[PDB]
Amino acid sequence: PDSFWYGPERPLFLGAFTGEPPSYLTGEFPGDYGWDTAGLSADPETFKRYRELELIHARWAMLGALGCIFPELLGSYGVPFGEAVWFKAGAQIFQEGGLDYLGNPNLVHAQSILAILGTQVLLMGAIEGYRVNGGPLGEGLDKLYPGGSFDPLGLADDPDTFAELKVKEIKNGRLAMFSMFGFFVQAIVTGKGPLQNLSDHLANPGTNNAFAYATKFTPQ
Amino acid sequence: EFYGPNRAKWLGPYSENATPAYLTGEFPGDYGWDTAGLSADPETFKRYRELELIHARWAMLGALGCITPELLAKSGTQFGEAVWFKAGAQIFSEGGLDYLGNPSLVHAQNIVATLAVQVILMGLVEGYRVNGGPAGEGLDPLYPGESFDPLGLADDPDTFAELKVKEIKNGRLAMFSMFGFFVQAIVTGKGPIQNLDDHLSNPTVNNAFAFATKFTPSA
Amino acid sequence: LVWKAMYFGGVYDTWAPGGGDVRVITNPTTNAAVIFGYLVKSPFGGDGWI
Amino acid sequence: MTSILQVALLALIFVSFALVVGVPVVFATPNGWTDNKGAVFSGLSLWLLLVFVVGILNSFV
Amino acid sequence: KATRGWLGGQGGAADLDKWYGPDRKLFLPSGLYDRSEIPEYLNGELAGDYGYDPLGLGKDPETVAKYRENELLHARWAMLAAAGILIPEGLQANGANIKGGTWFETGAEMLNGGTLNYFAVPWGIVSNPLPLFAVIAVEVGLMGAVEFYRRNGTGPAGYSPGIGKFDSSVFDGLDPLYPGGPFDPLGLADDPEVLQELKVKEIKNGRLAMVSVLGFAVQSYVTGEGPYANWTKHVADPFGYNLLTVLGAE
Amino acid sequence: KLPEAYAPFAPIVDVLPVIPVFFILLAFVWQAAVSFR
Amino acid sequence: MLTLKIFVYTVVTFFVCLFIFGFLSNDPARNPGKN
Amino acid sequence: LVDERMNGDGTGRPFGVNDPVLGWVLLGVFGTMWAIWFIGQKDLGDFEDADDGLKL
Ligand code: CHL
Numbered sequence: 001p002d003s004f005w006y007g008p009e010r011p012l013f014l015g016a017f018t019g020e021p022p023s024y025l026t027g028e029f030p031g032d033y034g035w036d037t038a039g040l041s042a043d044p045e046t047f048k049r050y051r052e053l054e055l056i057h058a059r060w061a062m063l064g065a066l067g068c069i070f071p072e073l074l075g076s077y078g079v080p081f082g083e084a085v086w087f088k089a090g091a092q093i094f095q096e097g098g099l100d101y102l103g104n105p106n107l108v109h110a111q112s113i114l115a116i117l118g119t120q121v122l123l124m125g126a127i128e129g130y131r132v133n134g135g136p137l138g139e140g141l142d143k144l145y146p147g148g149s150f151d152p153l154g155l156a157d158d159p160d161t162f163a164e165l166k167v168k169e170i171k172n173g174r175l176a177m178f179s180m181f182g183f184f185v186q187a188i189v190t191g192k193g194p195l196q197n198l199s200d201h202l203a204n205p206g207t208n209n210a211f212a213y214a215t216k217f218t219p220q
Numbered sequence: 221e222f223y224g225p226n227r228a229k230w231l232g233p234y235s236e237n238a239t240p241a242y243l244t245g246e247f248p249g250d251y252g253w254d255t256a257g258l259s260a261d262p263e264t265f266k267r268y269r270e271l272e273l274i275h276a277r278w279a280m281l282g283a284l285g286c287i288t289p290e291l292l293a294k295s296g297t298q299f300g301e302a303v304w305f306k307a308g309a310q311i312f313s314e315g316g317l318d319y320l321g322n323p324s325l326v327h328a329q330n331i332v333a334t335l336a337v338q339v340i341l342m343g344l345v346e347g348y349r350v351n352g353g354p355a356g357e358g359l360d361p362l363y364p365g366e367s368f369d370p371l372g373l374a375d376d377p378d379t380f381a382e383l384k385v386k387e388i389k390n391g392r393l394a395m396f397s398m399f400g401f402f403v404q405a406i407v408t409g410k411g412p413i414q415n416l417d418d419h420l421s422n423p424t425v426n427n428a429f430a431f432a433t434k435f436t437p438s439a
Numbered sequence: 440l441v442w443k444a445m446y447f448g449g450v451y452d453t454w455a456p457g458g459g460d461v462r463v464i465t466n467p468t469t470n471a472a473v474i475f476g477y478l479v480k481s482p483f484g485g486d487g488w489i
Numbered sequence: 490m491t492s493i494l495q496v497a498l499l500a501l502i503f504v505s506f507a508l509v510v511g512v513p514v515v516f517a518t519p520n521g522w523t524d525n526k527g528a529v530f531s532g533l534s535l536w537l538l539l540v541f542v543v544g545i546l547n548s549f550v
Numbered sequence: 551k552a553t554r555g556w557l558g559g560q561g562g563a564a565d566l567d568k569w570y571g572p573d574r575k576l577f578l579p580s581g582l583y584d585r586s587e588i589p590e591y592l593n594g595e596l597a598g599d600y601g602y603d604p605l606g607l608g609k610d611p612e613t614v615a616k617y618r619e620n621e622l623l624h625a626r627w628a629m630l631a632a633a634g635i636l637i638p639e640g641l642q643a644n645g646a647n648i649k650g651g652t653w654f655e656t657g658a659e660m661l662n663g664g665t666l667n668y669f670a671v672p673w674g675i676v677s678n679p680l681p682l683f684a685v686i687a688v689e690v691g692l693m694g695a696v697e698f699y700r701r702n703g704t705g706p707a708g709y710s711p712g713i714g715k716f717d718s719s720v721f722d723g724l725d726p727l728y729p730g731g732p733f734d735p736l737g738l739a740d741d742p743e744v745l746q747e748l749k750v751k752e753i754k755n756g757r758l759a760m761v762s763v764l765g766f767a768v769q770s771y772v773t774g775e776g777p778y779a780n781w782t783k784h785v786a787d788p789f790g791y792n793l794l795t796v797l798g799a800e
Numbered sequence: 801k802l803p804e805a806y807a808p809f810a811p812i813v814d815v816l817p818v819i820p821v822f823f824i825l826l827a828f829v830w831q832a833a834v835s836f837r
Numbered sequence: 838m839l840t841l842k843i844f845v846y847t848v849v850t851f852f853v854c855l856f857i858f859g860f861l862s863n864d865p866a867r868n869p870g871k872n
Numbered sequence: 873l874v875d876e877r878m879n880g881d882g883t884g885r886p887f888g889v890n891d892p893v894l895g896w897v898l899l900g901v902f903g904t905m906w907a908i909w910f911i912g913q914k915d916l917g918d919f920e921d922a923d924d925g926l927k928l
């Protein structure tokens with residue numbers, strides 16, 4: 001296309017020091033900064049599969065980051081969750097009262113983990129089978145951008161706006177995946193919720209940073 | 221030898237049929253070991269070669285910089301902390317980080333400033349390597365020469381190829397040794413020179429098998 | 440101004456014990472919340488803004 | 490040496506008055522800046538020399 | 551020799567019209583110094599030419615070159631001297647046992663039978679066991695040989711400076727004050743316009759070093775301490791410790 | 801008070817603060833010189 | 838009594854946001870002159 | 873205490889909020905208005921060129 005994010009004049013991941021990007025990264029796909037130093041996308045089929053994997057990971061991680069942030073914020077403000085922290089919310093089902101959505105005893109009130117696992121397995125199996133092979137909500141649609149019933153508001157009719165929104169989606173998804181990797185590492189190292197880590201850093205930025213835990217995993 | 225068809229191989233004599241077709245002994249250190257077939261595509265092969273060379277050089281530097289302070293401390297120099305995997309924590313000491321223990325050298329006390337300076341300088345130099353900079357622009361990505369070969373030790377082609385093979389072999393040895401450093405530090409918990417001294421003290425009992433049951437999953 | 444108050448002499452602290460005097464501000468309040476609470480504080484009585 | 494300091498300070502005052510009276514005249518007079526560069530340079534240099542000398546004398550008093 | 555800029559983009563000598571040619575920078579601004587009064591012998595040829603010559607000490611181009619030789623030699627010696635005056639004092643004041651300390655006291659440290667400690671920044675500090683007379687003899691012999699080589703224009707063949715190209719034989723044809731070749735192991739002077747820019751930088755840094763060394767001497771005579779001590783004390787107490795305070799302390 | 805060495809120059813200082821005001825008046829005088837062109 | 842505070846805050850915020858975003862909506866080009 | 877009060881006159885709370893619902897209302901209203909303005913921005917004309925806008 002003819003836009004700032006496509007073609008040979010697109011921005012690249014090393015600024016002026018990037019040089020010439022790899023030949024197969026011609027710049028016809030969203031979020032193409034020409035960063036394939038490892039050379040894992042030489043084969044176009046592998047490139048397509050990696051693009052699909054990246055997009056699915058991006059959407060899942062956007063959802064995951066939002067769902068990790070929101071309950072802890074609400075619990076900090078005062079909502080009585082069973083376990084507000086993202087990496088502890090799974091253990092609520094072992095509590096005597098069971099899992100309670102929003103802390104209310106009349107919302108969901110789940111008791112058995114086996115039923116949750118079984119229903120999730122069935123529903124998600126059907127969902128992903130429909131995603132791979134066309135189902136009730138469209139049959140002959142694109143694998144990554146089905147549109148149709150999944151774009152009710154008609155935000156992707158204009159091809160130029162469609163490309164712009166694709167770039168925005170991929171960029172926000174990459175940011176979300178980076179932040180989710182940060183979530184995992186901070187949970188492993190610090191042991192507190194991400195909002196707790198942010199509050200601690202804001203309280204004393206000079207000392208409450210990552211280096212404070214640097215001497216945590218040293219062997220003895 | 222070390223080049224062409226009749227070159228040394230990764231299985232010695234029992235290697236005539238082991239070598240893949242695409243490995244034809246054109247590049248240095250080509251022993252024909254691609255059992256997993258990860259470099260069938262020539263572009264991926266070139267990228268892996270570049271990664272291997274950079275890793276080898278960094279591993280050479282890392283191995284030398286891990287060995288040197290411990291030996292110097294054994295010689296009788298007070299470093300504050302000589303063990304390689306504990307040498308980064310002395311930046312938080314009250315006396316700061318002093319080169320060779322001398323209080324009038326470096327004497328760094330802030331870690332954020334050092335990290336920022338390293339980020340800026342290393343970003344600039346890595347960008348110079350990728351696309352070219354003050355030293356030169358149109359040179360080989362792996363062997364620029366010119367400003368990076370002042371003594372001119374690489375000017376006759378066969379000598380250049382032999383030196384390249386020596387470089388790659390020393391680098392593979394350094395990478396293996398650095399992986400050993402990491403595993404020994406995780407398992408044993410003492411510096412590599414201390415480990416060597418302990419092994420020399422009593423080899424029959426001071427070996428890796430003494431720590432076999434350390435990571436038993438009993439619970 | 441910060442260097443003058445911190446290293447080269449000091450500033451006249453009027454809240455020092457007894458009558459105020461010149462003092463060096465060794466620990467300025469750099470906390471973000473405390474610093475930015477003044478700006479968003481109400482200007483009416485009791486609060487007084489900055 | 491207060492007498493020397495006071496004499497130098499009075500000389501500085503006189504030189505400064507002469508400069509502030511003359512510089513606008515030299516600037517605004519057509520074809521005057523070209524043929525009076527030396528006088529203006531000497532006056533400014535003398536002003537700077539006198540103020541520095543007064544400072545040194547104050548340090549000595 | 552194809553290079554790129556330090557911060558990306560094209561690399562080279564940028565623009566050389568600021569220091570060469572009829573258009574250039576001068577020791578006074580445009581409004582105070584018209585281009586007509588520039589002396590005829592002060593044309594945009596020599597590096598670092600600001601059209602500065604009150605009292606007309608220079609008369610014509612060959613005398614200008616004769617004085618340029620002395621200016622460049624003095625500049626390089628003053629750069630070396632400023633470095634060797636500043637660094638050892640700062641090293642000693644921070645913990646090292648240099649035993650020489652301030653520059654104006656290092657000479658007397660080697661009087662009588664005394665020796666001098668030499669610090670190899672990265673590496674240790676050694677106690678150089680040479681006596682004073684041996685130092686004098688070695689210095690006079692080596693400096694005489696080197697200056698005789700410089701004056702004659704020819705010298706011995708193939709010494710060992712870590713040079714990029716070895717086995718130097720003849721010095722014939724090398725420009726005095728810029729021999730290059732054997733004296734340029736890194737080969738940074740191959741590009742001509744880059745060489746001109748480097749010449750300008752060299753002469754400017756050298757003039758700064760000359761003025762700084764004169765300041766070293768004068769303020770060390772006045773205050774009685776080394777330049778490093780004066781710098782640190784002034785930074786610690788700007789208004790308390792300066793020239794005006796030092797003068798007439800009693 | 802001023803330092804004793806600068807004691808005799810006390811009257812001059814007494815006139816200094818009002819000098820900027822005169823500047824504005826000078827402007828009008830200048831306009832009178834050019835007949836308010 | 839806090840419900841009144843919520844209502845007043847909502848109304849004031851709505852009007853202030855209207856004012857702020859009104860002048861960001863290419864206001865200087867609303868003149869009737871020719872340019 | 874005879875009755876109940878908010879007790880926040882002289883506390884100097886930021887933006888005069890002492891309950892998180894007030895801050896949530898502030899952010900929600902501001903975000904809704906900003907979203908409406910962002911959606912309607914297409915009708916205001918784009919100043920993409922470097923030299924554009926009312927000027928003299
Ligand atoms: C003729 C006999 C001969 C044999 C059998 C080999 C075989 C080998 N050579 Mg070769 N070579 C041989 C002759 C020669 N080599 C070479 C030159 C080279 C080079 C330069 C290299 C090799 C390498 C290799 C290795 C490649 C495969 C590998 O990585 O193994 C991996 C699998 C094993 C080693 C088996 C597993 C070990 C053990 C039995 C299991 C351990 C169990 C643990 C306790 C597990 C516990 C952990 C738990 C917690 C999970 C392999 C050991 C490469 C190498 O050494 O990489 C490591 C290499 O770089 N060879 C020359 C010179 C021309 C030879 C001359 O005859």
Ligand SMILES: CCCCCCCCCCCCCCCCCC(=O)OC[C@H](CO[C@@H]1O[C@H](CO[C@H]2O[C@H](CO)[C@H](O)[C@H](O)[C@H]2O)[C@H](O)[C@H](O)[C@H]1O)OC(=O)CCCCCCCCCCCCCCCCC
Nearest residue numbers: 160161164861899900901902903904906910911912913914
């Ligand atoms: C009042 C004081 C309060 C206290 C102090 C607060 C300080 C806050 C400081 C930071 C924010 C300052 C914002 C000032 C207002 C100016 C906003 C503006 O001029 O913004 C103008 C720009 C214009 O953006 C451009 O708009 C263009 C036009 O787009 C249009 O056209 C495009 C195709 O060309 C697309 O089709 C697109 O969809 C279509 O809209 C393009 O899209 C460009 O890519 C795009 O960059 O916007 C942008 O800068 C991007 C948005 C900027 C940040 C906005 C944050 C808003 C709040 C977020 C959180 C809300 C939460 C709500 C929760 C609700 C539920 C509880």
Ligand code: CLA
Nearest residue numbers: 281282284285288289299301302307318319320321326672
């Ligand atoms: C990439 C590899 C690498 C890395 C990341 C490090 C990192 C570190 N080293 Mg190690 N080191 C290395 C390679 C490396 N070293 C090698 C190859 C050597 C052998 C020369 C050493 C010898 C060494 C010693 C002896 C000491 C360290 C120390 C340190 C720490 C302080 C760094 C500092 O302030 O230096 C920056 C210092 C300066 C800029 C001051 C000038 C020093 C110059 C640059 C040295 C240059 C050496 C020269 C180029 C090569 C040797 C020449 C010789 C053959 C003649 C830091 C953890 C110090 C420490 O904390 O002890 C544990 C310490 O005492 N290192």
Ligand code: CLA
Nearest residue numbers: 516522529530533575576577578579580581582583584585
């Ligand atoms: C806002 C202030 C300002 C600005 C933008 C300029 C800008 C300019 N001046 Mg003017 N000038 C100024 C103040 C200023 N000057 C003052 C205060 C003086 C009296 C000394 C002069 C005297 C002067 C002369 C005589 C001439 C110019 C000329 C010029 C032009 C080119 C040469 C140049 O940059 O000046 C060069 C000025 C200097 C080298 C003075 C030294 C400046 C150094 C960097 C000290 C900086 C101090 C520090 C950064 C700020 C101190 C803050 C506080 C103590 C006040 C340029 C358009 C020339 C021109 O246009 O020719 C036709 C010319 O002939 N200026």
Ligand SMILES: CC1=C[C@H](O)CC(C)(C)[C@H]1/C=C/C(C)=C/C=C/C(C)=C/C=C/C=C(C)/C=C/C=C(C)/C=C/C1=C(C)C[C@H](O)CC1(C)C
Nearest residue numbers: 035036037038039057060061064067068086089177180181
């Ligand atoms: C580019 C390139 C190039 C060259 O050549 C080579 C290389 C380098 C290799 C490459 C790179 C790559 C990368 C970087 C990657 C990364 C990734 C990631 C990080 C992802 C994430 C990703 C991430 C993700 C998905 C995430 C997700 C999440 C989730 C789901 C979550 C969930 C949840 C929640 C909500 C909360 C609750 O309570 C619980 C749970 C349930 C848990």
Ligand SMILES: CC1=C[C@H](O)CC(C)(C)[C@H]1/C=C/C(C)=C/C=C/C(C)=C/C=C/C=C(C)/C=C/C=C(C)/C=C/C1=C(C)C[C@H](O)CC1(C)C
Nearest residue numbers: 253254255256257278279282285286304305307395398399
């Ligand atoms: C061939 C093949 C074939 C088939 O087909 C397949 C397969 C098998 C896969 C393949 C194989 C491969 C391999 C073996 C690999 C390995 C690698 C390595 C080991 C690396 C390292 C690598 C390593 C490295 C880099 C290292 C580095 C290091 C460093 C830097 C260090 C540094 C340091 C020092 C000095 C010390 C101080 O105190 C600090 C620090 C800072 C810490």
Ligand SMILES: CCCCCCCCCCCCO[C@H]1O[C@H](CO)[C@@H](O[C@H]2O[C@H](CO)[C@@H](O)[C@H](O)[C@H]2O)[C@H](O)[C@H]1O
Nearest residue numbers: 544547548549550788789790792793794795796798803
């Ligand atoms: C380029 C511009 C730089 C300007 C210089 C910056 C100001 C620093 C110089 C200050 C003058 C020198 O100060 C030095 O001599 C003065 C002599 O009168 C002393 O000043 C003294 O004068 C009187 C006694 O005669 C007393 O009323 C003062 O309390 C006393 O301070 C200073 O105590 C001394 O430190």
